[PDB]
Symmetry: C3
């Protein structure tokens, strides 16, 4: 099972344009060369060229609906094709709104997959609950089957078909959830481990419980959508929405080390790295290097050591 | 059950006068407005005006005995009256010597209460074991029934009646205990979770064990006396006696989140915040904002989210 | 059982000469005076004068073989003599290559001892697997019986007799292991708790499992070889080989507190403190003071408190 890197220099899901530079910074930090040192064969598809939409007026409060909808449609097609060829897709983020296209294309080939979402946020607001209008905080709402028809058709997304049910996803790291989003996860009964649960259980028990919950019945493809702000700002300061009291460096690596050990990783998203948001040049280097270490961990690099 | 904020701008229990500004900084950080966003009805009694004692010579080694004794007598009366009216009392600290008055007035209405003491110190020296003479490190000694008659009558405190027995209190966070204090907790058998126990058990098991220990037999009123130096100096740097290796931000919030969930919180003390002790202006803002987050957590704010 | 401090100002096991100053900095921080405040009787043997070898050409890739071999032979004799007199030996580090002499002399008197190695590294490369040639990363290879005859005779070490078998040692804190070293620990089946295991289990369960593993059958002498880089660079920045994601201050103290409680500590090594490697003067003070706190903990100082 080879790996295929796919760049997604997109920032229309939020207001800060620098996340577009995420892919470049990750590559410049030597991401591809290091992955070639693993047991996997690596392939770089390159970066995608997203067709911008000039006249893109807000749908109600939702900003850049048509541009976000089209870029995600392009991504889904690309991901589905590589999945169709028996390869693991690695999407280099880009604001988190690109998860719509990443997960959608994945589910086209592997309809039985489950999703592990590492983030300080649930990203499940709907076009009607959102207060900001930024689509990087609404991706999960377009993918959940239970939310289908809970909000008006948004321009640019008629191509989307809800592909995951409430019981197929698990959140880890939550600590900044909007009132509407909380009502939704409680009502629909979505499984989550907020920082409170990580403190209570310990990251060891957290990973054990997420795997038995999702892989109890039968085994199946895993899709890990990693938002860099899942970790505390001390570790990943260069992000658009940092929240204090997050996961540690050690905990972030433990999550990815356990996911590698299942042998079921099928799709990966590394999102929200913004290289123009450091407080200093090293805060940037710190964030980019951590994202690279997490990616390598998903593919075999272990803290105990490695040998051929 | 409404809440009643009570300010206690007092600093005679120790040498640094800046703790008197604790209440003002907490209010300026928006403490009251935010509490009004919870499910509780809020009431601000205001700050107390403590009658200073001009001729206040040291009783042996004990400094400002009469001024500390009178200010606490005034506080007890105020707290007992609001408790008498079915309200939860919130005392805005002030050096920790004000816990004598806070707990005393509380026990007048709820004699069956238990005490959870979060601190790096036990604050249980007696007028005869103390080496500094500062009363903010002796409050527990005036409240324990087992210590009654273990030291000479101190001027200004003849109004005090020991209201709690050794089995009714639990310490969390200890890491700077004097030899005399250690002899006392071992001899009397007082329950505690020092940093060693938190490391061994994890904060999850620590809260589980403190609740079964205190609320095993029957349910009853809870009094949480929180000393801001319970958390590591990296989180709450603006305090008079910082000790390395303390509780994390996450652990501090876990403690308060669990106490809220019991539905038994009856009295609260937020102590030792000194706004004139930062190394920088942000070290101050960091400490004040953390104290506010802890207070809000005691009244319902959860990291998983909230909705009406 | 009295204690005997033994200084080892040596740096030929690696390239940076400043570790030679480790002993002096530790003593200047008041190490001996504080140990005299414990229940043990303290004795300072002083620092050793190591006979340098002028013509010391590299054995293959191994640097300073004869100088490292002789200094360790001198140390072993000194340690064995104090052990012979019923005293606990405390070796003030010095690069970690001095563990060869420390452990060797100890095993001469207590052949049944076990070893607890706290380090970010396994220090088990052989003269043939090493890529740097620095002997401070090869001490364990000269002491393991299973590795005897696995590499050519190195000049200066013909006096060494492998004294410990693979089942007699436990590693804690690993996070920077070379491919050759990993092949060795997996093949020989050596017990270890890398950072992954500490994250999964918690330091409490880690200490419980290392004690049952080593002291399950019968009780016996414990030798703790502590490399200061076992803790994260935020706590012990003044070291030659710092690695991110290490043990916390709290975890380091928990390890030593548990070792004291067994009553089986027989030999101690405090290594790799280099007072000329801070980024600032306080990074140095931070590292030296932490090493002193760890040493005091091994001999009775507890975070819960102490009294006579
Ligand atoms: N819920 C907030 C924040 C969204 C956070 C988006 B994220 O997790 O992708 O960075 C909003 O909807 O604007
Ligand atoms: N035990 C020391 C320190 C007291 C700490 C007081 B506290 O916890 O209220 O800040 C003393 O009695 O002087
Ligand atoms: N394995 C690397 C690093 C050795 C680390 C040595 B130590 O743990 O004593 O600081 C080397 O052999 O050069
Ligand atoms: Mn986020
Ligand atoms: Mn996100
Ligand atoms: Mn205190
Ligand atoms: Mn206190
Ligand atoms: Mn090391
Ligand atoms: Mn070492």
């Amino acid at each position: 099972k080879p790996i295929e890197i796919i760049g997604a220099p997109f920032s229309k899901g939020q207001p800060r344009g620098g996340v577009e530079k995420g892919p470049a910074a990750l590559r410049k930090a030597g991401l591809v060369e290091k992955l070639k040192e693993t047991e996997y064969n690596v392939r770089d598809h390159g970066d995608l060229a997203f067709v911008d939409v000039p006249n893109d007026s807000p749908f109600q409060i939702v900003k850049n609906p048509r541009s976000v909808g089209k870029a995600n449609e392009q991504l889904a097609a690309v991901v589905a094709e590589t999945q169709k060829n028996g390869t693991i897709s690695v999407v280099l983020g880009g604001d988190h709104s690109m998860a719509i296209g990443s997960i959608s294309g994945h589910a086209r080939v592997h309809p039985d997959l489950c999703v592990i979402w590492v983030d300080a946020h649930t990203d499940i607001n709907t076009p009607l609950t959102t207060s900001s209008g930024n689509l990087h905080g609404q991706p999960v709402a377009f993918l959940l089957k239970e939310l289908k028809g809970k909000f008006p058709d948004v321009p640019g997304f008629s191509w989307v078909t809800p592909c995951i049910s409430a019981k197929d996803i698990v959140y880890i790291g939550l600590r900044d959830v909007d009132p509407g989003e909380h009502y939704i996860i409680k009502t629909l009964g979505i499984k989550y481990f907020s920082m409170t649960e990580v403190d209570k259980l310990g990251i060891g028990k957290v990973m054990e419980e997420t795997f038995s919950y999702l892989l109890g019945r039968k085994k199946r493809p895993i899709h890990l959508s990693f938002d860099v702000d899942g970790l505390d700002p001390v570790f990943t300061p260069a992000t658009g929405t940092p929240v204090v009291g997050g996961l540690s460096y050690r905990e972030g690596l433990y999550i990815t080390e356990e996911i590698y050990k299942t042998g079921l990783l099928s799709g990966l998203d590394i999102m929200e790295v913004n290289p123009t948001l450091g407080k200093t040049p090293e805060e940037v280097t710190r964030t980019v290097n951590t994202a690279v270490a997490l990616t390598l961990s998903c593919f075999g690099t272990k803290r105990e050591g490695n040998h051929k």
